[PDB]
Amino acid sequence: NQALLRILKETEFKKIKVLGSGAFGTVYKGLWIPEGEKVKIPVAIKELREATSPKANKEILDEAYVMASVDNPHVCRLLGICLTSTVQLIMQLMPFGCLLDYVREHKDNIGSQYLLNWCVQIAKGMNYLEDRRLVHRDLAARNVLVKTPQHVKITDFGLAVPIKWMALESILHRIYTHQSDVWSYGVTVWELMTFGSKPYDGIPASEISSILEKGERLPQPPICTIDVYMIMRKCWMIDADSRPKFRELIIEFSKMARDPQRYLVIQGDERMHLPSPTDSNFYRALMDEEDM
Ligand SMILES: CN1CCC(c2ccc(-c3ccc4ncn([C@@H](C(=O)Nc5nccs5)c5ccccc5)c(=O)c4c3F)cc2)CC1
Numbered sequence: 001n002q003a004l005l006r007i008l009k010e011t012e013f014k015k016i017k018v019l020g021s022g023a024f025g026t027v028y029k030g031l032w033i034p035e036g037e038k039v040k041i042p043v044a045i046k047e048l049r050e051a052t053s054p055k056a057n058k059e060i061l062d063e064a065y066v067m068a069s070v071d072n073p074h075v076c077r078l079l080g081i082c083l084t085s086t087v088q089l090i091m092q093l094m095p096f097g098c099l100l101d102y103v104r105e106h107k108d109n110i111g112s113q114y115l116l117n118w119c120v121q122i123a124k125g126m127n128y129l130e131d132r133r134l135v136h137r138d139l140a141a142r143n144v145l146v147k148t149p150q151h152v153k154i155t156d157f158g159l160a161v162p163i164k165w166m167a168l169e170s171i172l173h174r175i176y177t178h179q180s181d182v183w184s185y186g187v188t189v190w191e192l193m194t195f196g197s198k199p200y201d202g203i204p205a206s207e208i209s210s211i212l213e214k215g216e217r218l219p220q221p222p223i224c225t226i227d228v229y230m231i232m233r234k235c236w237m238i239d240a241d242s243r244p245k246f247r248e249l250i251i252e253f254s255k256m257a258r259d260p261q262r263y264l265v266i267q268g269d270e271r272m273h274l275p276s277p278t279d280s281n282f283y284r285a286l287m288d289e290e291d292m
Pocket residue numbers: 024027044045046048052056059060061063064067076077078089090091154155156157158
């Protein structure tokens with residue numbers, strides 16, 4: 001259990017390049033230098049923005065042991081931690097980056113088979129987190145990492161502000177449940193189907209709470225048939241108990257992924273690279289050897 005989180009010494013890893021930043025910290029590409037070795041192993045390091053006292057460090061550690069204990073092909077795992085004045089967290093480095101950047105940079109080359117499978121895989125990861133009594137609380141395309149173009153994994157979940165991803169009851173009452181996570185999942189699917197559009201673009205965050213109670217929702221993505229948009233809309237129902245369950249969303253997107261051209265309308269979809277077996281084996285042997 002506690003063997004799943006490696007406590008690292010400052011002297012055995014090095015930050016080498018900034019990857020990006022978010023609400024809680026800054027992510028670096030870094031290098032692990034095993035003691036007694038000459039090799040340098042790439043890692044991703046998140047340094048927390050606010051220095052902490054050893055008293056808050058107990059809380060951070062308590063949670064780190066949980067994030068190091070997840071084991072599902074579609075959920076990322078915490079690997080290590082270094083408790084400096086500002087805490088540094090270590091996980092596997094995903095050279096392809098997050099799914100949001102991936103769909104933005106490939107807006108004109110992503111076919112429906114990929115999009116629907118990503119939706120399946122994200123739902124699978126969220127379903128595993130629910131089975132483990134874990135609520136994500138910040139699900140968005142930016143917190144889905146691309147291991148290979150064929151394999152995405154959820155990151156940066158937790159235990160107990162992105163207003164535009166949050167369920168209405170989260171905005172108003174600080175209520176976060178698995179059903180509010182289903183709301184955020186709906187927005188994430190919308191980001192993918194719009195190839196990374198900003199949700200409610202230009203609407204001030206102060207006024208999102210109002211327009212949701214008045215019944216507006218994110219618009220139907222241009223490539224979406226009504227069958228797909230109906231799923232997104234059910235995720236944004238005000239009564240949290242009416243939203244689909246992750247178990248149901250897996251089944252639904254798996255059905256659609258068996259005939260992706262019936263449910264997503266993409267120009268050039270017939271010419272788009274579909275995940276070939278030869279390409280799948282190659283990718284897995286170089287970057288992705290886990291069971292899946
Ligand atoms: C009340 N006060 C104010 C601030 C409080 C606070 C409490 C807890 C934590 C905390 C603890 C453990 C964590 N464990 C992992 N992670 C993810 C992660 O490291 N991401 C990465 N990206 C790249 C490299 S590492 C991650 C990675 C993989 C799967 C899930 C989650 C965390 O963010 C994480 C975490 F923020 C931070 C701050 C403490 C005191």
